[PDB]
Every structure is written in structure tokens, then in C-alpha cells.
């Protein structure tokens, strides 16, 4: 807690505003009040008379739609001296430094004599307010000229909190009174006196626009406009009572900004409605009560951490929208009501004002999810979470912040089509003041009703919506709008539910004798798409059936049909980014591959079933030692293989899945290594013979494995299953592991570091591999999108020639970090969201100073405890102490399976580690510069290939794409097993050996999967190399130089590049075609 408390204090002083600018603004607006005093009064005027007053003036009255017409504007207009006051955060002195800038809210109280008791009907008070603003702007403008301040002051109108009904004047300063450095803008709010209109008449249920339907939005604006100082006085009291009021406020402010939460309007579409004031008003209420029994949940003695914890805890678990609401008295213990108004409600009995009126239902769930999601990190003790909760902006990219994004282009967008405009209807102008508010509600409701359980959260954003307009104009002007609609286009963003996203059929209400209302709306909503279907269980229900595709999810089709049918038949819905991502995933060459969804693992299961049949045979075979257990460890067994398994597609590198065979513990195992495997081979030999005799349909052969250094006698049995799958079997013996330890102990001190590396690979293949496949497999079920995203991640690495040096396990652990540790983000539920988040992590990962440690557990045991957590931390510090610059080790990946942290990340050259991070950083930079689109995504997955010193082009004799099981094909294994090799791609084996020979001098790379990244034929692969700095320049000759060089002087040599190329060329033989240097 002490660490967290000090972290808070550090954050506050960093964001603390500089007091010098406070004086600078205080100097200005203090004089501004004097200018307001000069402004003269006015007499009663009709709309005709005020219009004559403003016909020729540069200023234009910003009348709120519907603008007053001569018939209904019988009530007259007048201006009188307001009672100025300063309100907002600046009044409470709780503001902070904001690079984008802050705003100071100065309130103008229209004198009460300028209103009638019934001016809150039919925009009567609003239009009076508009001219009052207009009259002030004219006089303020001329006086600004008189004082010569106009030179550096720019004046424009704007909507308060993006509220179209409340235009305001904004003062900002361009580059003595110049406050441009202060980064502040004075906002002039024309508020109403308190209690001018009976608040009971302004309750949300009541209506104030005659046409009856209620007017919650219109009622809130006028009532809120009349209640500003009262809340300030309410807040002003509280900060005395609790010493930590302003501190608790700013922590809320920073938290809200990172999540992209603001006080601005939300029914328009912008995510927000919950701002500092709502955070402050809420937290004030909790200090006065908040419980069902009206007990205090927060105490004035609480510190900033406790005050912040309670409000975040409060918002997380108690519901304010559907079931339950709060009432408090600003002027009486606050109590939680179980009843709900179906909308975010924070009632104030003293003022009869709901503070959450601007807060939308859809946004409220997201707000609730964030608080509850953060409450989990706040309670977390294993890991520090200060940075994530507060120092991480998740609103930078929507696609990172939202799983799916669809942009919809409405028709006729210099006015919207008559049909869509006609759909607006009069009941909705009274309900929704602006068509933008109505249209956002329309698209939300159909999208929510259509998708249902397929999604968790939906956000509708109106791209290109402006809120400030020139003083010469009455309302905001959009380029496509033509003063009709203030937006460019609508973007539909979702947080999908992986569990039920891809369901083929959307279930509906059950059949009945009489058509029920719920069923009725179901049939009407889906129209022809509606159908009544029966199932195996025998239930009869109304449901509509969709079709799965390998290119796009069901979510794309449903929203397209639903929006077109209800919103407008001419709408255009397009999300090509996900489609391009889907296409990059290699399409398997199985029946109905195209119609298969990306989340289906039937291919993997079929491979497992084939293994099960063999798994039975080997048990029943009699051997000298009873078989103990066979543990499959292949990539496909954990649903991580880049391309799905395909029968007889033996050209695939991952065709042969490794399998560990272990026998009963015996004392007769050889005590010397070389005999031990040769005994293991003897066991494999007998297994092959009996398998050949009893089960002739199975085919088998032996192969040479040399992955473990210096153990040149480990022999593996490759089994070709009749279903068309390959399995590689290796024997594990308990004596095996001690023998390697024996080798390390007896080895010379200089050689011990080499031997331990040999052990490191052994445990990586035999011991840790078992644990790796087990946990990833089980975890993969909860994380539906893990199996796809990892495969694209490996595909992305292969394109840039990184898989050759990066072990497949390491890629998996990097790719699961966004899932086991999604904070501050959510669990990815989309292919795009998961992949880019992996990119985001790698870009910002400081592997030199920050270790990567993962809790391989299912979503909320085996969770890392404090002792284990600290233990892993000490390991990183000890390693970095020996390797500060990180040459020997770059990536530190540890978990329960890997406490050492070096198992899967050892031996990677630093250039490849830097190249990996360098690629991730640049990729993120491209995203910021240019948005996700077809052009960018192509750049992400195409290799530059120019940075490499020399590049070698290779082509295989035949196209391997068909034999790899990739649909742009063998149906049986060759009669002669020697004929497997002719359809193989050996370039990786070429590179690995060439790496060994030129380890001291060169770093060669190539594409592992040629069928995927080898063109249409899958036959072209490229070998790329790098010359180290030391051998790039000339060197003095010495015996230990260990490089192919040529003389220049009697004691100087230089790298012999041309000789190396010839060695490379003839090694590939006919494979090599061209050399680029």
C-alpha cells in the first residue's frame, strides 16, 4: 500500500498545474468581468424587432431547432445585467495540467424578471437564452475592440457538453493579457436562476414540449441550466468535510480520460456522459450514504486511495440503470432504491435533477465493466497495477479498444433522403430533439435486438461531428451535412461475445397456439429471414439460420441485413479489415473449408481421433517393459499449428507431430548415454515390427533427430496413420535426465556453460514440452480466439523471416499475454483485436528492464503467489545483473511451467530480437499515421527485404502449396517412402546448418512455411543474410578468426563474400536461382 500511496503522490505533482498560469488567467477574466459590467441593458423586443437588430450585425443568434417562427414567438425578448459567477473544476481548484488544454466555466445568471412561470414550455426559455447570448456577444465583441484585446482573442459559439440545446460562447487566445501559454479557454454559460420553474414539472416522466411523450433530455437541460451554483455549494461544503476531496477528484479525472470518458453528450453517439462532475457528485453522495440501509459507504476520514476505491467498487457492483437507482439530497441520507428506471439514473430529490441523463444505457454497461474490471486490479496484490489503471490510454485506437468496427454510409449524404427524414416522426422530435440522437437510438436498438447475446457491448460513434461554429452562423455546419446533419458517417463498434458469436442459428421465442408478443416482434423484425424450426430435443421455436464463412463472421452478415431492412435499404455496410485478416489465415484443403468458421477446430479433433486409434494399439502390444504413458506434444494437439492439419498433406513442416513414449521405471537402463538411446531405439524397433505385423495398414520409418546438441544417436519413429496423419515418437527414460546432469558435473569448467545449454534444449523438448502443451490446450478452450491469432502471429513472423530463430513456444507465450493479462484492455474477442494487441505489447515491451511473466490460468488455484512472483523477479534481476545490456538473453518469459524464465528464449541472436521489436514499433507508427485499411494491412504482412546485406532467391522444383493442404493434392502416401523427400522443402535445414558454420560471421534467415508464403505455387523461398560489424570491416589475421576471408595486406584480411555465395549456391543446388547483394 505504501508503494501505491507514493505512486499516487508522484502522479499528482506531475499533473499539478503551474500556479503562475493561474494568476495569468485570474488577471484576465477578472478584467473580463469588468467588460461585462460595461455592457448596457435592453428593452422588450419581439422576434421581428430583435431580427431587425441582428439583420445587419456580423453576429447571428444561435437559435436552437426548432427556431422560433413569427406565429409562435409572441412572447417578447429582453436583456438585463446578469449575476456573474465562476463554476466548474476551476471554482473548486481541482484542475490539473492538460496538454490539449482546459476550460474555465463562468456562469451568467439571466435575471429572473426576464422570465415567466411557464417559460419552460415549447423552448420558450431556450430562445430567450439564445438572444441573451447573442446580445452579449455583439457588445462583448465591440468592447473587445475598444480594449484592443481583439488582436489575440478569437470568439466562437459552441454547445455545452455537446448539448445542441445549450449554445455557449468560447473565448480562446491565439499566439500582457495573452493567456495562450496557459492553455485555457474561458467558457461563458448563460444559466438560469434557481427555482424559476417548478422542478416537479421538469421531472423526467413529465413533458414540456407540446405536440403525451416525456422529454427527459429537454427537461434536463433547462433544469440543469437553473441548477449550477447549488451543486457548487454542495461540492464546496464537502471538500471541507473530507481533506481528500480534491485528491479523490483528480484520480477519477485521470482514470476517466484514459478510458476515453467525458462529460459530453452520449445520446449523440460519443462515448462519455460520465465526467469529473458526475464522478464528484457521485462520490459526494456516497460520503452522505449510498447503502440500501442508508449507511455511509465512504467516510470523511478516508484517504485518496480509499475514496477512489469505494466509488470504483460502488459503480462496479451496484446497478443504476435496469434494476436499482440512487437518490440523494444536495441541500437526507443517500439511499439505494431497488427499483430502476431502465436508464442510468442518479436522482437528486432536493433539485429533482437526474445527473445521469446524459449517460446512455449502452455506455453505462461499458462504464460498469471498466470499473468492475479495474476493481479486480485494485484488489490485486501479486502485481503492481498503478501504471495500467492510470498511465495507459486505451482510447488511442478504436480497433484495439473495440473488437469489431463497421462504418455505415447513409444515403444522400445535401440532405438525407425523404424516407429516412420521414421516419424521424413528430413523436421523436419531442423525444429526441435532434435526428442524430434519434438515429443513434434507432441503430442501437436494431443492432442490440438483432445481435443479442452474440455481443457484450455496442458503441455507435458519429464520425466527424462538430460542436463549435462561427459567430456568424446560427448552427453548426457539416460539409456533407449542409446544416441538416452534423456528421460524416456512423461507425458501429462492438465488444463481441466469443462463446456465442459464431452460432449458426439465432434462437427466438418458442412456438405457441396464440402468437405471443415476443414472438410477434421476432417475426416482424426478421421478416422473411424469420422461420419456425424444430430440433433434435423436440422443441419448436422461431429462429433464423445463417451461414458460416471463412472470410467474415456471422456478425457482419446479421448487422448488414438488420440495418438495411429497418434503418434504410440504401445503407452501405463494409468492414474489409477483418476480411483481409481472415484471408491471411491459410485456408485448409478440406471439404467445406470456405464455409468453415475461423473458430472451428474440427480438423484438430480429427487428428486427435486418429491418434486415439494408434494410442490404443500401442498399449495392447506386448513389450519387455510395460508402456507407462504416451503424451502428445505436437503443435496441433494444442491448436497452435499455423495451418490446420490435412490428411496426407505431408509436405507440411508440422505434419509429423511429436509424441513422447515413456516406459515403466526399470533398473536395467544403460548407465552410459550412448547405450541408453540405442536401447530406446531397440524399443522403437520392436514397436515398429509388431505394428507392421499386426496392423499392416499403418506405415512407418525411422529418422535422424539432432535438435539436442551433441546427442547424435536419438532416433525417432515416424508413423504414417491410415487416416493420413503423421506422428513422430521418441522415448523418454528417467535415467536420461540425471545423465545430462552427470555430464555437466564432470565437464570442464570452460565447457560447463556449453553442456547446460544442451540440457536446456533437452528439457525444452522432453520435460517442459509436456507441461506446455497441457496447459495451453486446456486454457485454449476458454480463450476462443487464441488458436487463430497465434497462427497469424506465426504467419506474420514467417513473412519477415523470424520464425527460424524464434521457437514456436516463445511466439505462443508472447501471443497469450493479451489474454492472461488483458489489462488495461478487455479480453480480445476478434481476430483483428487479438493480433494488433500482440503488436502493441511488443512495441512497448522493454525486455531489457521489464520481464514478461504470465499466469497461465483460466479467466476468473494455480495463480502465482507473492512468494513465487518475487522469486521470479529476483531471477530477472540476477540475470540482468550478469547481462545488463541483454546480449546473451533478450526476452525473459517465465511462468509456473518456466520459473527460470530462459527456457524458450535462449539462443536468439540480438539482431532478431531487436528486429522483432523494431518491426512492432514501426507497425504501430504506421497505424497512428494511417488508419487501418486495405493498403496498410498489406504493408504489415509484406517484407521489405532491403535491410539485409545480401538476398538469395530459391525456387522448389514443384509447387508445394497443394501438398501442404492449402486451398489456393496427394490422396495417399507414396509406395516408396523415399518419395516423401522429393516433395519436401529443405531450405530451412540448409539455413540452420549454414548458421552453424557462419555463426561467428553471418546470420542467415529464411521462410519456414513455403506453401503459405511462397507465392501462388508455394514454391519460392528466400535466404537472407547479415554480416556482423567485426567481420564487415577488415581484420588482422589470426587462427581463431573462424571466418572465410581474403588477404588484403600481409597482416590484414577481409570477408570473402563471393566465395560464401558460391557455397550457398551449390548447397541449394538447382534450388538457388539468383543472388542480390
Amino acid at each position: 500500500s505504501n508503494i501505491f500511496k507514493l505512486q499516487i503522490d508522484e502522479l499528482l505533482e506531475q499533473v499539478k498545474l503551474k500556479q503562475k498560469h493561474v494568476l495569468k488567467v485570474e488577471k484576465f477574466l477578472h478584467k473580463l468581468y469588468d467588460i461585462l459590467q460595461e455592457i448596457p441593458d435592453w428593452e422588450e423586443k419581439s422576434l421581428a424587432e430583435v431580427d431587425s437588430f441582428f439583420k445587419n450585425k456580423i453576429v447571428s443568434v444561435p437559435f436552437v431547432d426548432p427556431k422560433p417562427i413569427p406565429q409562435n414567438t409572441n412572447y417578447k425578448f429582453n436583456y438585463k445585467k446578469p449575476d456573474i459567477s465562476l463554476i466548474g473544476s476551476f471554482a473548486l481548484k481541482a484542475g490539473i495540467y492538460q496538454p490539449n488544454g482546459s476550460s474555465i466555466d463562468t456562469l451568467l445568471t439571466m435575471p429572473k424578471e426576464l422570465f415567466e412561470k411557464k417559460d419552460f414550455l415549447n423552448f420558450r426559455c431556450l430562445h430567450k437564452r439564445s438572444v441573451y447570448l447573442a446580445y452579449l456577444t455583439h457588445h462583448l465583441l465591440i468592447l473587445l475592440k475598444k480594449d484592443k484585446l481583439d488582436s489575440f482573442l478569437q470568439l466562437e459559439y459552441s454547445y455545452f457538453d455537446n448539448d445542441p440545446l445549450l449554445p455557449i460562447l468560447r473565448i480562446s487566445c491565439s499566439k500582457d493579457y495573452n493567456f495562450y501559454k496557459t492553455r485555457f479557454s474561458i467558457n461563458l454559460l448563460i444559466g438560469f436562476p434557481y427555482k424559476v420553474f417548478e422542478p416537479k414539472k421538469l421531472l423526467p416522466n413529465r413533458n414540456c414540449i407540446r405536440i403525451l411523450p416525456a422529454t427527459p433530455l429537454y427537461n434536463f437541460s433547462v433544469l440543469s441550466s437553473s441548477t449550477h451554483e447549488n451543486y457548487l455549494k454542495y461540492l464546496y461544503k464537502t471538500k471541507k468535510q473530507t481533506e481528500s476531496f480534491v485528491e479523490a477528484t483528480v484520480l477519477g479525472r485521470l482514470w476517466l480520460q484514459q478510458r476515453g470518458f467525458s462529460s459530453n453528450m452520449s445520446h449523440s453517439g460519443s462515448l462519455g456522459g460520465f465526467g469529473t462532475f458526475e464522478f464528484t457528485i457521485l462520490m459526494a453522495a456516497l460520503l452522505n450514504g449510498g447503502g440500501i440501509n442508508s449507511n455511509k459507504i465512504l467516510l470523511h476520514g478516508f484517504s485518496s486511495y480509499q475514496l477512489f476505491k469505494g466509488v470504483i467498487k460502488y459503480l462496479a457492483t451496484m446497478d443504476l440503470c435496469h434494476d436499482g437507482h440512487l437518490q440523494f439530497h444536495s441541500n437526507p441520507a443517500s439511499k439505494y432504491i431497488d427499483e430502476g428506471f431502465q436508464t442510468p439514473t442518479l436522482f437528486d430529490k432536493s433539485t429533482k435533477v437526474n445527473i445521469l441523463t446524459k449517460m446512455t444505457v449502452s455506455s453505462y454497461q461499458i462504464l460498469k465493466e471498466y470499473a468492475g474490471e479495474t476493481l479486480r486490479m485494485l484488489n490485486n496484490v501479486v502485481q503492481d497495477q498503478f501504471s495500467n489503471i492510470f498511465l495507459t490510454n486505451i482510447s488511442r485506437f478504436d480497433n484495439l479498444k473495440y473488437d469489431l468496427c463497421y462504418d455505415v454510409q447513409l444515403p444522400l449524404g445535401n440532405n438525407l433522403e425523404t424516407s429516412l427524414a420521414a421516419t424521424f416522426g413528430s413523436m421523436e422530435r419531442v423525444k429526441f430533439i435532434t435526428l442524430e440522437n434519434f438515429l443513434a437510438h434507432k441503430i442501437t436498438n436494431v443492432a442490440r435486438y438483432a445481435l443479442g447475446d452474440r455481443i457484450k457491448y455496442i458503441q455507435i460513434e458519429m464520425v466527424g461531428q462538430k460542436s463549435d461554429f462561427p459567430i456568424t452562423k446560427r448552427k453548426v455546419y457539416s460539409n456533407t451535412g449542409g446544416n441538416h446533419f452534423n456528421f460524416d458517417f456512423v461507425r458501429v463498434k462492438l465488444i463481441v461475445n466469443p462463446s456465442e458469436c459464431d452460432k449458426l442459428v439465432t434462437k427466438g421465442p418458442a412456438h405457441s397456439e396464440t402468437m405471443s408478443t415476443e414472438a410477434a416482434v421476432f417475426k416482424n423484425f426478421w421478416g422473411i429471414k424469420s422461420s419456425l424450426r424444430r430440433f433434435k430435443d423436440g422443441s419448436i421455436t422461431h429462429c433464423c439460420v445463417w451461414s458460416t464463412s471463412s472470410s467474415e463472421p456471422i456478425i457482419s452478415s446479421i448487422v448488414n441485413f438488420a440495418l438495411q431492412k429497418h434503418v434504410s435499404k440504401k445503407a452501405q455496410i463494409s468492414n474489409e479489415t477483418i476480411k483481409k485478416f481472415h484471408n491471411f489465415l491459410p485456408l485448409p484443403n478440406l471439404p467445406s473449408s470456405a464455409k468453415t468458421s475461423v473458430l472451428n477446430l474440427s480438423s484438430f479433433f480429427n487428428l486427435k481421433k486418429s491418434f486415439d486409434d494408434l494410442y490404443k494399439i500401442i498399449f495392447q502390444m506386448k513389450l519387455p517393459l510395460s508402456v507407462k504413458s504416451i503424451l502428445p506434444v505436437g503443435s496441433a494437439f494444442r491448436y497452435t499449428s499455423l495451418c490446420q492439419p490435412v490428411p496426407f498433406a505431408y509436405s507440411d513442416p508440422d505434419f509429423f507431430q511429436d509424441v513422447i513414449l515413456e516406459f515403466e521405471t526399470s533398473p536395467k537402463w544403460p548407465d552410459e548415454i550412448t547405450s541408453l538411446e540405442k536401447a530406446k531405439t531397440a524399443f522403437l524397433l520392436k514397436i515398429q515390427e509388431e505394428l507392421s505385423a499386426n496392423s499392416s495398414t499403418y506405415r512407418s520409418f525411422f529418422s535422424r533427430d539432432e535438435s539436442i546438441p551433441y546427442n547424435l544417436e536419438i532416433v525417432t519413429l515416424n508413423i504414417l496413420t491410415p487416416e493420413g496423419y503423421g506422428f513422430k515418437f521418441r522415448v523418454l527414460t528417467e535415467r536420461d535426465e540425471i545423465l545430462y546432469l552427470r555430464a555437466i558435473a564432470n565437464a570442464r569448467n570452460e565447457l560447463k556453460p556449453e553442456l547446460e545449454a544442451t540440457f536446456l534444449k533437452f528439457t525444452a523438448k522432453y520435460l517442459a514440452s509436456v507441461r506446455h502443451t497441457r496447459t495451453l490446450e486446456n486454457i485454449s478452450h476458454s480463450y476462443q480466439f487464441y488458436s487463430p491469432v497465434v497462427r497469424l502471429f506465426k504467419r506474420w513472423l514467417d513473412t519477415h523471416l523470424l520464425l527460424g530463430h524464434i521457437t514456436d513456444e516463445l511466439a505462443e507465450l508472447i501471443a497469450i499475454k493479451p489474454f492472461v493479462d488483458p489489462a488495461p484492455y478487455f479480453i480480445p474477442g476478434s481476430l483483428e483485436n487479438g493480433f494488433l494487441k500482440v503488436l502493441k505489447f511488443i512495441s512497448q515491451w522493454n525486455w531489457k528492464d521489464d520481464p514478461l511473466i504470465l499466469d497461465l490460468v483460466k479467466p476468473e488455484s494455480e495463480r502465482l503467489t507473492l512468494a513465487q512472483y518475487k522469486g521470479i523477479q529476483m531471477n530477472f534481476t540476477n540475470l540482468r545483473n550478469s547481462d545488463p545490456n541483454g546480449t546473451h538473453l533478450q526476452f525473459f518469459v517465465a511462468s509456473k511451467n518456466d520459473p527460470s524464465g530462459i527456457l524458450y528464449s535462449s539462443g536468439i541472436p540480438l539482431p532478431i530480437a531487436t528486429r522483432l521489436t523494431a518491426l512492432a514499433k514501426v507497425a504501430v507508427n504506421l497505424l497512428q499515421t494511417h488508419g487501418l485499411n486495405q493498403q496498410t494491412i498489406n504493408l504489415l504482412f509484406t517484407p521489405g527485404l532491403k535491410d539485409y546485406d545480401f538476398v538469395v532467391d530459391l525456387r522448389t522444383p514443384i509447387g508445394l502449396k497443394s501438398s501442404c493442404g492449402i486451398l489456393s493434392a496427394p490422396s495417399n502416401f507414396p509406395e516408396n517412402l523415399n518419395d516423401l523427400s522429393e516433395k519436401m522443402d529443405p531450405t530451412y535445414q540448409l539455413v540452420k546448418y549454414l548458421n552453424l558454420k557462419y555463426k561467428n560471421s553471418l546470420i542467415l534467415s529464411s521462410r519456414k512455411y513455403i506453401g503459405v508464403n511462397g507465392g501462388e505455387k508455394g514454391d519460392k523461398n528466400v535466404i537472407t543474410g547479415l554480416i556482423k560489424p567485426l567481420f564487415k570491416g577488415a581484420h588482422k589475421f589470426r587462427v581463431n578468426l573462424d571466418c572465410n576471408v581474403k588477404p588484403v595486406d600481409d597482416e590484414n584480411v577481409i570477408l570473402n563474400k563471393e566465395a560464401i555465395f558460391h557455397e550457398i549456391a551449390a548447397f541449394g543446388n538447382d534450388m538457388v536461382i539468383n543472388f542480390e547483394t
Binding site: 519477415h800 522493454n846 525486455w847 531489457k848 545490456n885 541483454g886 546480449t887 533478450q890 540480438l910 539482431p911 530480437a913 531487436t914 528486429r915 521489436t917 523494431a918 518491426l919 514499433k921 514501426v922 507497425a923 504506421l926 504493408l939 504489415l940 509484406t942 517484407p943 521489405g944 527485404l945 532491403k946 535491410d947 539485409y948 547479415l1026 556482423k1028 560489424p1029
Partner: peptide, 14 residues
Amino acid sequence: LSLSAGFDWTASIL
């Protein structure tokens, strides 16, 4: 075009 990043051999990008 393509994603091209200058190869770093001193871990300077980090």
C-alpha cells in the same frame, strides 16, 4: 510498399 526497419545491433531501439 513494405514494413522496413533498420537493423539494430546495439539494442538501441529499446
